[PDB]
Amino acid sequence: ATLFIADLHLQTEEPAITAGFLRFLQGEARQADALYILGDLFEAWIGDDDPNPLHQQIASAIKAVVDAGVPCYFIHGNRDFLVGQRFARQSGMILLAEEERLDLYGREVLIMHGDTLCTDDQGYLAFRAKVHTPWIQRLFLALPLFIRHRIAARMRADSKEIMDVNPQAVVDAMERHHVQWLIHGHTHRPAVHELQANGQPAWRVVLGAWHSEGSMVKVTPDDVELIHFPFLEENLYFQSHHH
Numbered sequence: 199a200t201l202f203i204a205d206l207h208l209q210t211e212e213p214a215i216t217a218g219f220l221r222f223l224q225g226e227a228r229q230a231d232a233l234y235i236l237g238d239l240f241e242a243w244i245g246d247d248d249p250n251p252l253h254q255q256i257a258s259a260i261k262a263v264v265d266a267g268v269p270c271y272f273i274h275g276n277r278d279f280l281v282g283q284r285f286a287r288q289s290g291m292i293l294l295a296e297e298e299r300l301d302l303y304g305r306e307v308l309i310m311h312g313d314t315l316c317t318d319d320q321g322y323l324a325f326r327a328k329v330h331t332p333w334i335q336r337l338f339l340a341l342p343l344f345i346r347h348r349i350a351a352r353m354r355a356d357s358k359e360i361m362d363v364n365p366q367a368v369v370d371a372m373e374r375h376h377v378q379w380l381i382h383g384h385t386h387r388p389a390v391h392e393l394q395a396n397g398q399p400a401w402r403v404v405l406g407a408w409h410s411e412g413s414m415v416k417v418t419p420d421d422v423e424l425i426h427f428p429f430l431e432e433n434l435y436f437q438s439h440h441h
């Protein structure tokens with residue numbers, strides 16, 4: 199089976215999510231044919247030279263999955279678009295493009311973070327175009343780390359419902375790639391949607407954010423599974439009752 203996750207928004211202020219992801223990497227992920235992380239792995243990223251210990255702890259945990267024979271892939275989210283090749287080398291992850299077409303047991307599948315489908319938020323897409331301009335990224339990354347951390351903290355303070363996808367953008371993307379299956383995150387609305395693309399039924403599968411429980415999509419030769427699971431090993435104890 200091939201696994202997909204997104205929208206973990208890892209951060210040191212939410213250690214339960216981190217513990218949940220570490221348990222996922224040490225368990226389920228080790229049995230997978232591959233693991234794809236479709237963006238927003240981290241709640242923030244200001245560049246690979248950031249010494250935040252969480253980054254090294256996550257890199258090491260992913261690298262153990264890779265070393266165990268499970269290739270791991272990353273598509274950037276809007277929170278962590280600055281993840282670069284230094285982190286890719288540290289974690290053993292392979293960085294992919296913003297859209298990729300996969301062969302999953304014969305099923306052709308488009309994968310993407312999903313924010314580019316949200317074409318009714320023209321303000322967001324304009325800002326997105328700016329922070330994805332290479333010369334702007336290179337200027338930001340050249341700033342001292344403490345300056346980047348101040349900029350990012352102010353921006354997060356200033357930003358504190360997610361616009362959903364545009365149905366026509368979905369059809370356009372799925373016809374550009376000639377697929378009947380699309381997996382994405384970003385909208386934080388885990389679901390399976392049927393539509394029509396390329397003159398045939400098509401499906402859009404949406405990952406959940408890791409808010410109170412984890413979420414993954416598991417693709418097998420036989421089916422597509424949207425799975426919700428607890429972060430920690432929920433230890434069984436017997437609550438007494440009476441009838």
Ligand SMILES: O=C(CCCCNC(=O)N1CCc2cc(S(=O)(=O)N3CCN(c4cc(Cl)cc(C(F)(F)F)c4)CC3)ccc21)NO
Nearest residue numbers: 238242243276277329334335338350353354357360384385
């Ligand atoms: O995502 C969703 C829901 C939609 C959410 C849409 N809002 C969103 O994404 N936000 C809002 C606040 C925020 C802060 C971060 S950040 O703290 O990591 N960091 C800020 C500084 N960044 C920067 C980079 C560059 Cl190149 C240039 C510049 C500068 F502006 F200075 F020029 C700054 C790098 C990134 C990352 C994402 C965001 N569902 O999935």
Ligand SMILES: [Mn+2]
Nearest residue numbers: 205238384407
């Ligand atoms: Mn997200």
Ligand SMILES: [Mn+2]
Nearest residue numbers: 238275276384
């Ligand atoms: Mn997002």
